[PDB]
Amino acid sequence: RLNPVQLELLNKLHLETKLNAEYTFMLAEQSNWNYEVAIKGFQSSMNGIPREAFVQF
Amino acid sequence: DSGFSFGSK
């Protein structure tokens, strides 16, 4: 599923926030699938994300 | 799990 575009975004998201894909996706959706906000998204909450979602990032 | 949020929604 998902559109190769949104997917690629997940990659950048999992390669920029690296907060675990599954979760990163949670961000790809909780971020309106923007990007800039996505990134910031991770860097946003950064106070509730677990160790499972945040993998060394 | 889920229900988590990022960018100030």
Swiss-Prot record, chain A:
<protein>
    <recommendedName>
        <fullName>mRNA export factor MEX67</fullName>
    </recommendedName>
</protein>
<comment type="subunit">
    <text>Interacts with nucleoporin complex NUP84 and MTR2. Interacts with MIP6.</text>
</comment>
<feature type="domain" description="TAP-C">
    <location>
        <begin position="4"/>
        <end position="57"/>
    </location>
</feature>
<comment type="similarity">
    <text>Belongs to the NXF family.</text>
</comment>
<comment type="function">
    <text>Involved in the export of mRNA from the nucleus to the cytoplasm.</text>
</comment>
